[PDB]
Amino acid sequence: SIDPTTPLTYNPVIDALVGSWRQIIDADYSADDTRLPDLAVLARSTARAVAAAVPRPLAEISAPDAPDERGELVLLEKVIQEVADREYTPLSPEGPSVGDLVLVTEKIYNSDREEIGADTGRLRIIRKDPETGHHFTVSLVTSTVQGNKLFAFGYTEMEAQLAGGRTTIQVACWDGPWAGMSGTLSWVINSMTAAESRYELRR
Amino acid sequence: SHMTTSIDPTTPLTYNPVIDALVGSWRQIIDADYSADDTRLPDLAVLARSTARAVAAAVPRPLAEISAPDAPDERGELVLLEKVIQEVADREYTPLSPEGPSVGDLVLVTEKIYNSDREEIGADTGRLRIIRKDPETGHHFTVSLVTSTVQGNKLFAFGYTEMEAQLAGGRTTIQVACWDGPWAGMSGTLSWVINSMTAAESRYELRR
Numbered sequence: 001s002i003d004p005t006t007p008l009t010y011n012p013v014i015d016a017l018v019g020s021w022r023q024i025i026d027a028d029y030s031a032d033d034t035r036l037p038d039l040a041v042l043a044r045s046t047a048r049a050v051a052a053a054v055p056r057p058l059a060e061i062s063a064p065d066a067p068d069e070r071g072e073l074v075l076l077e078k079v080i081q082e083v084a085d086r087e088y089t090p091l092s093p094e095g096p097s098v099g100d101l102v103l104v105t106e107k108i109y110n111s112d113r114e115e116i117g118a119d120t121g122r123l124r125i126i127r128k129d130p131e132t133g134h135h136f137t138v139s140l141v142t143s144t145v146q147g148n149k150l151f152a153f154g155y156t157e158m159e160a161q162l163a164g165g166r167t168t169i170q171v172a173c174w175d176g177p178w179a180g181m182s183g184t185l186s187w188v189i190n191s192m193t194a195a196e197s198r199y200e201l202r203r
Numbered sequence: 204s205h206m207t208t209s210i211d212p213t214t215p216l217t218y219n220p221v222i223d224a225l226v227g228s229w230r231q232i233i234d235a236d237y238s239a240d241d242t243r244l245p246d247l248a249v250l251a252r253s254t255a256r257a258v259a260a261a262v263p264r265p266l267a268e269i270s271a272p273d274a275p276d277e278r279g280e281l282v283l284l285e286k287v288i289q290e291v292a293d294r295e296y297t298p299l300s301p302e303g304p305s306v307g308d309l310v311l312v313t314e315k316i317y318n319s320d321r322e323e324i325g326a327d328t329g330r331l332r333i334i335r336k337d338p339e340t341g342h343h344f345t346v347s348l349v350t351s352t353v354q355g356n357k358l359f360a361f362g363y364t365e366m367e368a369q370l371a372g373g374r375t376t377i378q379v380a381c382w383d384g385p386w387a388g389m390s391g392t393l394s395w396v397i398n399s400m401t402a403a404e405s406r407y408e409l410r411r
C-alpha cells in the first residue's frame with residue numbers, strides 16, 4: 001500500500017515550499033475552470049526556491065544584487081525507472097477525468113542495471129483541453145537517487161507522454177551530493193510500467 | 204491612530220493557500236534563530252527572487268495566458284511606479300546589545316507612501332531581521348518581509364540586503380509580487396535610496 005504523505009525535511013522553509021505545491025495537487029479542479037495559476041512558472045520557481053533554501057558555506061551564497069549564475073552541470077542519464085506499485089481508482093468508467101488522482105512508486109536503476117534508489121509520485125488530472133481533448137496533470141515526486149534526496153514538481157501533458165514524447169518536470173535536491181542544486185528530470189516511456197529518465201541539475 | 208498602539212506583526216492572509224504557504228516559507232527565514240557564530244546559510248538572494256516569482260505565478264489567470272509546460276520563460280511589458288516617497292510612521296526596535304546593531308536584532312516598521320504631490324497613495328509594514336555579520340568586512344546583512352498596499356495593489360516583498368550600504372545612500376533592492384489589484388500576478392523589484400533615517404525615494408518595477 002502506497003504511503004501518500006509527503007516526507008518532511010525538518011527544514012521549515014523547504015517544508016512550507018513543498019507544502020505550497022501540495023496545495024496545487026489537492027486544489028479543486030473542474031472541467032468548467034476558466035482560470036489557473038501559471039503552473040509551469042510556479043513549478044520552476046518552487047524548485048529553484050527549494051534548492052536555494054538548503055544551507056551552504058557562507059562563501060557560496062550570492063551577494064544581494066548578484067546576477068543569476070548557475071554552477072556546473074551534474075548529469076545522470078539512461079536511468080531506468082520501473083513501476084513497483086500504482087494506485088488509480090477512476091472517478092468515471094468512461095476514462096480519465098479532471099480530478100483523478102494517481103499514486104505510484106518506482107525502483108530506480110542506473111544504465112548498468114544497478115539499483116540506485118526509489119521514488120513516489122502523486123499525480124492529479126487538472127484539465128481536459130476542449131480543442132485537443134488532451135489532459136494536463138500536476139505532479140509531486142519524492143525520491144532518492146544515488147543518495148540524493150529530491151523533490152520534483154510537474155505540470156505536463158499526458159498524451160504527449162503516452163505518444164513517446166519527452167516529458168520534463170522540475171527537480172530540486174535538498175540532501176546528498178547534489179544538495180542545493182536544481183534542474184530538470186525528463187523521461188521517455190518504454191511501456192506502461194517502465195521509463196528511461198535523465199537528471200540535469202546545477203547549483 | 205488612538206486605537207492603534209503597536210505595529211501588527213502578523214502577515215495578512217490571502218486565503219489562497221498556495222500563496223499563504225509561500226509567504227510562510229519566507230516568514231520562517233525572518234524568524235529563525237541567528238547567531239554571529241553561524242557558518243552556513245541558505246542562498247537568500249536566490250530564495251527571495253524565486254519566492255516572489257512563485258507568489259505572482261500562484262495568482263490564477265485566464266487559461267489563454269498561462270505558459271505551456273515546455274515554453275521558454277517570457278515576461279510581460281513593464282509596469283513602473285517611480286518618484287514615490289515613503290516615510291516612516293512607527294518603528295519598534297529593542298536592541299539585543301548596547302554596543303549597536305547585532306545579529307538576531309528585529310525591527311518592525313510602518314510607513315506611509317506618497318506621490319510627488321504629497322497625496323497618500325499607500326502604506327506598508329516591514330519585519331526586518333539582522334541575519335549575519337560578514338567575518339571579513341564586518342558588514343551586517345538583513346532579511347525583510349514587507350506587506351504593502353500601493354494605489355490599490357496588494358504586495359508582498361522579500362529582501363536580503365546590506366545594512367551599511369543602505370545607510371550610506373546606496374540603492375537597495377527587494378523582490379516584490381502583487382497578488383491583488385491591477386498588478387495582480389506581476390513580480391519584479393522594489394528599490395529605494397534613503398534621504399534620511401526616516402524617508403526614502405522608491406521605485407516599483409513589475410512584469411507578468
Ligand SMILES: CO[C@@H](C)[C@H]1C[C@H](C)[C@H]([C@@H](C)/C=C/[C@@H](O)CC[C@@H](C)/C=C(\CO)[C@H]2O/C(=C3\C(=O)COC3=O)[C@@H](C)[C@@H]3[C@@H]2CCC[C@H]3C)O1
Nearest residue numbers: 289304310312329331332333345347362395400401402403
Ligand atoms: C536594515 O536593517 C534593519 C534590520 C535594522 C537594523 C538596524 C536597527 C537598521 C538601522 C541602523 C537603519 C535604519 C535606516 O537605514 C532605515 C531608513 C529608512 C528610510 C528605510 C526604510 C524604512 O525602515 C526601508 O526599510 C525597509 C527595509 C530595510 O531597511 C531593509 O530591508 C527592507 O526591506 C523597507 C520597509 C523599505 C524602507 C524604505 C522604503 C521602501 C520600503 C520597502 O535597521
